[PDB]
């Protein structure tokens, strides 16, 4: 079997990892990231009656509830948002509490259903 012989695989022109592209979530990864920071809040406190900035990231998983339709692929959206801005997450151990807060993200939403999201075989050096 020659290589000039043709690859024998298609159909590998799309697949849902392109639906990630269409995720863009700088928010609430800022909401995440941010959250852990601890020094960087904690500070300006508002009064309940007054709405607060922290109050419009929680719309971000409300928005993978139905907004942008997610599904199993989730894991591929939540690793991508760590990738989106994890360059940095070694420097620190921001990667624990980060993690943490990271594992509610998937709550607000409830994207749980499937027994198991992260395979062995594919990960991230991130994680």
């Not at 269409?22 to 601890?38: A, D, F, S, Y």
């Not at 998983?61 to 070694?90: S, Y």
Request: some cysteine; charged content about 30%; hydrophobic content about 20%.
């Amino acid at each position: 079997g020659p290589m000039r012989r043709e690859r024998g695989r298609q159909g590998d022109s799309s697949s849902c990892e392109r639906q990630v592209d269409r995720v863009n979530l700088k928010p609430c990864e800022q909401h995440i990231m941010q959250r852990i920071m601890g020094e960087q809040e904690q500070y300006d406190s508002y009064d309940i009656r007054s709405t607060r900035s922290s109050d419009q990231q929680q719309r971000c998983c409300d928005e993978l509830n139905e907004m942008e339709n997610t599904q199993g692929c989730m894991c591929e959206a939540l690793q991508q948002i760590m990738e989106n801005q994890c360059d940095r997450l070694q420097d620190r151990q921001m990667v624990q509490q980060f993690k943490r807060e990271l594992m509610s993200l998937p709550q607000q939403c409830n994207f749980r259903a499937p027994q198991r999201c992260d395979l062995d075989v594919s990960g991230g050096r991130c994680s």
